[PDB]
């Protein structure tokens, strides 16, 4: 399928790899909040909270999109190669999440890379989660059940999050959606890696790839984790998922083994290819029909628990 | 892959020279056991008589609340044109229903042989017309009524949003076509032949061109735009969800009608559902993408999330 | 991905009436005819007697002998464009590597002359090969049609034409990148590989090329215009080469696969990393030689029968 | 779809936990039922050894006609690192020299398990490095050499390639990997994961992680560009044709070898075979792919059309 002709229009518009990471995580802010304001999305209430963390003091914004306790929770994780982004850049999307799902959504400001290689993000992923099913009463959520969403990175982290808690024996996360995760973090080529990460078209590039990589990592064989490549993990006992991918996307082909895999194992797990768009394309929804569907599909899906 | 409850699913005799009358049977019986399983409640259900131009069409209407001013769906079962009723989509309409807060009406169409193509296009208009004038009495938003249809379904429910368009009528806000068929000549696209070999069952060569065979009365007729609608002018038309799924003859041409509705200006999103056939959605209670689509359409249409 | 050669050769490739159109096909043709400067033992132009009056052909002939395999090959052009010049260099190439006389036929072009006008003198062509085969220093019994593009669609239409007459000449077809459906009805890979960035056969080429060849658009719906509605039995074993990144990519394949279901030996060969039309451009393209070496030794050896 | 006589062929039908002298045994015995059909002719052909680093080597010097300074191809037959011989791909070899005019020099690399990964790779080199060093010996002319070989054969070729290049040395000329591996990770891609389920029969998920177990000491071995090519550097390598089969497992990583190679600004072309499976070259007397196949190779090989 071709891509979406606004799309194609958005794309002609003009990274390397020795900017320095400051420069390119206040791009990535300013180009983010572009989409935040035409959004415009009303929150009933939202506040910012510090939850404690092993590696200190870790930031969550907290959505609520209406009043009552016993609310159900989603832990959510921006994207942005583990390196940029942070809950200014996705506000828009965990707002209207919120609302639509009606769950209380927490988005998750973790440490990011160079500063903090690999696991810290990892860590600070699982103690925000599993903080937020310990303190309910203080959110007026669910007691110690969430669902765990991310985008990109972020979908890695959701995934790593719920093979964590699985390897804890915690039972917490009870679903998780995957919005065009990484799964596989290792220099291993997939069709689509090499296929949809030409400059062409300018959101995830082989040169970003492998730049968010020599961020991420403090040693290669660290790529090699289960919590670094959750398509490694073990997969069996893991909660019910929702796995969406992009057509034109380097990360397509892993995102859509990753849902297979996961039903290998008896796990419940759908994967659905969005046509004619790009990585990244959920942000996009104020001007993109098909990040406006997606929103709607996760919302539901969430909300209903439709894979379970 | 092959989601692998499918698999076990798909172990298992269609015949060309079948008689019509024995493949509705076996197709309510099997349709009939999913429906049991899926056990859907609904709050206010009834069969009514909409009077279309060829002769009297019955609609069962599902209305899973209390209120006027219901946004609504006009549904269209599949079966291929000579197959199903509103008996065998009813736990997918009921549970549309529910999870959307609309009102569902759900055509009972004619079906070929015994009415050929154009009889069941010129009903489902027919139909779909008849509850936007009807608001009142089906306590329903005259401005908030969306198509939907599967398959066959599928075709009808886009075909019927381009007549509507044609007579400068404005009472389809919203289509969602799931695994519509969109080209019904014989024009091979890679999806058609890959997905169609006997070992996937639901919608086969050999089944395809016997529906072919009872729709027209000429095979000609496969190049109308309101048996085709891939061929049509498609601007001014309404936003679109295309459902489409990984092993599915009718993929490819789904996929395409979306994005030729965008080259003509109309918002428009097909997503792909992997790991399943042509079908899935009434596999609900055993399948989860068939759970997952549900949930994904009634959101869409309860939002009108493309538009 | 499109191999990065390629990506350079249509950056530079941007930098009408149908004569015009011609005329630059045939100047940026000859551009890599004269880079590729075959060899060709003997080499001369013959009018062959259609049902539509004269037909030229261009005969090149790589060795000495009586008896030898026939090759008739129809250039591609969207049938608009091209002539025996265009092709030259690939017709020299097929029969020195393949040791065949190459009979490439210079048929009638659109819009001068409209469908069927082609098809008739692409089977006229054939068939007068096959019957003064003496005249030609040929064996009659080791004939094979092939084409690219346009002239894929000939040889196709051509074995099928053949095949309706029970004529047995045709013995084995290689069609490059043909064009099997000419009707609007839409593949993936057509709408995939037809925007501006692929240069070589975008949707408004394809669409004008329709408006040219045919009198009125649904003669496309003739099986000896779209020939994968034909029936396909009993025609002679192909070699059916397709392109990653070309809009007849999906038709070739399910043209291929038809055959099988109707008991044709036949093999479906994909090159990646190119576009429609790329064997002509084999001076500066490793898949271009590739294809080439590959149609002559399969047409030598009939390695598909 | 799958050519449809390839569907009875692989209709008419390993464990994990079978020994590897049986799984041997039964590869070599239906291996030389496919020679046998072939039949092929041969105008001298003799068994020579190849003294290696780690010993002996047998080869298979296939001499299709009179002459010296004959161009050559160094050929590795495939079988998982662990299964076949010279015996096994006897007859493609016999067809290659014919259509080719090329002496063939099939390489008898020690197996996995009892000769782990880099014994096949180093044997590889050995031989390829001895047949160009010995060319007044074969009567081959040390200035067309190619290197040849269908799956695990086509990475020991790969890996030669890259051997020869890290020394500074140039007598590969040429390579032809047939449905080569390329990765020998457990890293997955689409086709890996696709076209792996029992229903495909000739290279299935447990034959992989089997053949895995057999080849490696240690799991980070497969790490090594040694063992997985596509890891290396690709620059100043040999032009290349890269075969794959639609239906195959390494057709991914094969179709990306060829284009990383095109990056690193080396000639190669990568074609895809529709319709077929992993190893069907093999299987050329009863599948025109495969016959397709040797005449493309040799053709290519004689002329070194890439390059």
Same mark, same amino acid.
């Given at each position: 399928?071709?891509?979406?002709?606004?799309?194609?229009?958005?794309?002609?518009?003009?990274?390397?790899?020795?900017?320095?990471?400051?420069?390119?995580?206040?791009? *990535?802010?300013?180009?983010?909040?572009?989409?935040?304001?035409?959004?415009?999305?009303?929150?009933?209430?939202?506040? @910012?909270?510090?939850?404690?963390?092993?590696?200190?003091?870790?930031?969550?914004?907290?959505?609520?999109?209406?009043?009552?306790?016993?609310?159900?929770?989603?832990?959510?994780? +921006?994207?942005?190669? *583990?390196?940029?982004? $942070?809950? #200014?850049? +996705?506000? +828009?999307?965990?707002?209207?999440?919120?609302?639509?799902?009606?769950?209380?959504?927490?988005?998750?400001?973790?440490?990011?890379?160079?500063?903090?290689? *690999?696991?810290?993000?990892?860590?600070?992923?699982?103690?925000?989660?599993?903080?937020?099913?310990?303190?309910? @009463?203080?959110?007026?959520?669910?007691?110690?059940? &969430?669902?765990?969403?991310?985008?990109?990175?972020?979908?890695?982290?959701? =995934?790593?999050?719920?093979?964590?808690?699985?390897?804890?024996?915690?039972?917490?996360?009870?679903?998780?959606?995957?919005?065009?995760?990484?799964?596989?973090?290792?220099?291993?080529?997939?069709?689509?890696?090499?296929?949809?990460?030409?400059?062409?078209?300018?959101?995830?590039?082989? @040169?970003?790839?492998?730049?968010?990589?020599?961020?991420?990592?403090?040693?290669?064989?660290?790529?090699?984790?289960?919590?670094?490549?959750? &398509?490694?993990?073990?997969?069996?006992?893991?909660?019910?998922?929702?796995? &969406?991918? =992009?057509?034109?996307?380097?990360?397509?082909?892993?995102?859509?083994?990753?849902?297979?895999?996961?039903?290998?194992?008896?796990?419940?797990?759908?994967?659905?290819?969005?046509?004619?768009?790009? +990585?990244?394309?959920?942000?996009?929804?104020?001007?993109? #029909? #098909?990040?406006?569907? =997606?929103?709607?599909?996760?919302?539901? $899906? &969430?909300?209903?628990?439709?894979?379970?």
């Amino acid at each position: 399928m071709p891509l979406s002709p606004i799309l194609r229009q958005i794309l002609q518009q003009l990274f390397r790899p020795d900017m320095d990471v400051k420069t390119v995580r206040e791009q *990535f802010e300013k180009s983010s909040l572009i989409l935040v304001k035409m959004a415009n999305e009303p929150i009933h209430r939202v506040e @910012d909270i510090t939850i404690p963390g092993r590696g200190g003091p870790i930031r969550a914004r907290v959505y609520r999109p209406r009043d009552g306790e016993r609310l159900p929770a989603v832990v959510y994780y +921006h994207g942005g190669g *583990f390196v940029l982004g $942070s809950v #200014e850049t +996705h506000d +828009h999307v965990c707002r209207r999440l919120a609302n639509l799902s009606g769950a209380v959504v927490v988005s998750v400001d973790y440490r990011l890379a160079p500063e903090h290689k *690999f696991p810290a993000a990892v860590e600070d992923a699982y103690d925000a989660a599993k903080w937020v099913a310990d303190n309910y @009463d203080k959110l007026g959520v669910d007691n110690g059940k &969430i669902a765990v969403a991310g985008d990109s990175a972020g979908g890695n982290l959701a =995934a790593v999050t719920a093979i964590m808690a699985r390897d804890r024996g915690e039972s917490f996360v009870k679903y998780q959606v995957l919005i065009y995760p990484a799964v596989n973090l290792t220099g291993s080529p997939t069709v689509s890696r090499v296929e949809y990460s030409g400059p062409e078209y300018v959101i995830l590039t082989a @040169d970003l790839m492998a730049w968010f990589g020599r961020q991420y990592f403090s040693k290669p064989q660290d790529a090699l984790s289960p919590y670094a490549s959750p &398509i490694f993990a073990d997969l069996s006992n893991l909660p019910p998922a929702l796995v &969406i991918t =992009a057509e034109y996307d380097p990360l397509r082909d892993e995102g859509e083994l990753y849902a297979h895999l996961l039903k290998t194992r008896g796990v419940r797990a759908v994967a659905v290819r969005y046509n004619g768009v790009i +990585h990244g394309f959920v942000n996009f929804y104020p001007i993109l #029909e #098909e990040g406006r569907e =997606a929103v709607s599909q996760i919302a539901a $899906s &969430i909300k209903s628990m439709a894979v379970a």
